[PDB]
């Protein structure tokens, strides 16, 4: 799987910079390293990508209030090929200490624990993002 090109054609609201979109769409790119420091954090960008997301959450102290859809019709492969990307594109791999790339059996053994987006968001909450 190709994580570049599946990015690119889900890109309309990160970016393909990984930016994102001030008040609506959260910056990627500097973001992710500050997920994958917290304990639980890759599981958490897994979790994303499989259920979606929904309600009230800051980054780099902007407040977002939106939703993102699920998207589980990626593969398993493709779903770690994009996490990938969206961990390497931008440098942000590059803080955390050694990185480990996303893998298939990762995104497999969450796959088999069907979430909502609201849980979701609780799982983001316990890794102790606000």
Known sequence: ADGAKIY???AGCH???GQGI????????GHVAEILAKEGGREYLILVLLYGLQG???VKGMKYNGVMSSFAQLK???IAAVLNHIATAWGDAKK?????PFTAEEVKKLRAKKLTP??????RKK???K
């Open 96 to 100: 955390v200490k050694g990185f480990k």
């Open 15 to 17: 970016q393909q910079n």
């Open 127 to 129: 890794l102790g993002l």
């Open 22 to 29: 001030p008040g609506a769409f959260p910056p990627l790119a």
């Open 8 to 10: 690119a054609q889900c």
């Open 118 to 123: 609201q849980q979701v968001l609780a799982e």
């Open 76 to 78: 398993d492969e493709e």
């Open 56 to 58: 009230q959450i800051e």
